[PDB]
Enzyme design. Sequence first.
Site, short mmCIF file in Angstrom:
data_model
loop_
_atom_site.label_atom_id
_atom_site.label_comp_id
_atom_site.label_asym_id
_atom_site.label_seq_id
_atom_site.Cartn_x
_atom_site.Cartn_y
_atom_site.Cartn_z
N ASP A 85 12.47 6.18 5.91
CA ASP A 85 11.68 5.26 6.74
C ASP A 85 12.09 5.29 8.22
O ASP A 85 13.06 4.66 8.61
CB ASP A 85 11.83 3.84 6.19
N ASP A 127 6.20 6.68 12.30
CA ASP A 127 6.71 5.87 11.19
C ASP A 127 6.44 6.48 9.81
O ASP A 127 5.35 6.33 9.26
CB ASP A 127 6.10 4.47 11.26
C1 LIG Z 1 10.58 -1.78 6.21
C2 LIG Z 1 9.10 -1.31 6.03
C3 LIG Z 1 8.72 -1.02 4.55
C4 LIG Z 1 9.05 -1.89 3.47
C5 LIG Z 1 8.67 -1.58 2.14
C6 LIG Z 1 7.95 -0.40 1.85
C7 LIG Z 1 7.60 0.48 2.91
N1 LIG Z 1 6.87 1.70 2.77
C8 LIG Z 1 6.11 2.13 1.72
O1 LIG Z 1 5.96 1.53 0.67
C9 LIG Z 1 5.41 3.45 1.91
C10 LIG Z 1 4.37 3.86 1.06
C11 LIG Z 1 3.77 5.12 1.29
C12 LIG Z 1 4.21 5.94 2.36
BR1 LIG Z 1 3.42 7.58 2.62
C13 LIG Z 1 5.25 5.48 3.19
N2 LIG Z 1 5.82 4.26 2.94
C14 LIG Z 1 7.99 0.16 4.22
C15 LIG Z 1 8.11 -2.39 6.56
O2 LIG Z 1 6.87 -1.71 6.77
C16 LIG Z 1 6.94 -0.75 7.84
C17 LIG Z 1 8.12 0.19 7.65
N3 LIG Z 1 8.12 1.28 8.37
N4 LIG Z 1 9.09 -0.06 6.82
#
Ligand SMILES: C[C@@]1(c2cccc(NC(=O)c3ccc(Br)cn3)c2)COCC(N)=N1
Length: 379
Positions: free
Chosen positions: A34, A219
């Site tokens: 992430d 991101d």
């Molecule tokens: C911490 C935070 C966060 C929290 C929980 C889950 C996610 N990500 C996903 O579930 C996901 C799904 C499909 C794909 Br391709 C990429 N990522 C991200 C908050 O949101 C913005 C961020 N960049 N990070």
Amino acid sequence: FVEMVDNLRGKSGQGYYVEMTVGSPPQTLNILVDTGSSNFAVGAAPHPFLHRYYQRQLSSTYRDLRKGVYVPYTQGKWEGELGTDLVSIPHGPNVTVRANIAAITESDKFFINGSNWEGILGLAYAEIARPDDSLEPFFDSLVKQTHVPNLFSLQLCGASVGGSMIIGGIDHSLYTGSLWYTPIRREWYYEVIIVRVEINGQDLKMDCKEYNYDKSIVDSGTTNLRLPKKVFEAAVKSIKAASSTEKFPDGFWLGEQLVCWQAGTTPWNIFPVISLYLMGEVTNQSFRITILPQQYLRPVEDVATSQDDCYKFAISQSSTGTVMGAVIMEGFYVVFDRARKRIGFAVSACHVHDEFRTAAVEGPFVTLDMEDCGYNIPQ
Ligand SMILES: C[C@@]1(c2cccc(NC(=O)c3ccc(Br)cn3)c2)COCC(N)=N1
């Protein structure tokens, strides 16, 4: 780097993860990569959507920092306890480091059923770490303790999905053509500047500060291309115009509804290419990355609907600035060059293209207007 190739896995729309170990003896977990956050946070208690979790009582090297952490998101939240422990990446660099870990003890709408990851690796900067900027992010600890070079690169490959996270360098085997760099405007998120947007060759003709209201970031932890309201409405208008030979429910354009075609018959050619021009390293020079509909129309796998191919519109409205999420990153090799405060883009070895159009990274472009496109005052 070859040992790091193909070290990412995932399910479409569910997130790319890398295998890591925490604790002594090592406990294996799959961890979401992430670039839009800065905490290393792992499930540390049972949960219906978790197949395994970090069991601190079994790690002799765990040290409690006696500090709680609460992290609300727009959607979902988690709560936990801070500590440090030994962390490794089995298919990453050949080292073990001690790093901060947020042990997640309670959560809501955070973990995803069937995603196969159990925690998140926030790869952005300390400024946006929780509870505050004194909690050193993982990659900072990695660099300080091992002197691996201060950069990493991501190759996210769309459709099960996979890719590579190369830690400490650039693997030339993962891209073709030239690497183009855009400056990191501020080290908190990986913030960049968009200077122009075209949809099928047509300029949206906005003041370029609108594209970066109130920031633009890269991101890997967001699926969609997210756009400020004004830019989003303009983009939808243009895409609708291009695809006007077919009419879709308004719900589709809101990402509330799928559009389906008989398997194999998706009319790719009626959807336009989107070009994002990014600020170059020289004044008023830029380069563009071009996005095909195969990127921004995301297939939703469902056996029940599988007589068809069905898609979600993966461009959506944001009130927190532009987010260049996975639909942008997939098909490019993206270099997070922290040492030189810049992000590089090249065409990925696993890129998107039919027989008519190909995703591209190309330049240079020059602009007469001398306006700075950053939404805030430059430093
Ligand atoms: C911490 C935070 C966060 C929290 C929980 C889950 C996610 N990500 C996903 O579930 C996901 C799904 C499909 C794909 Br391709 C990429 N990522 C991200 C908050 O949101 C913005 C961020 N960049 N990070």
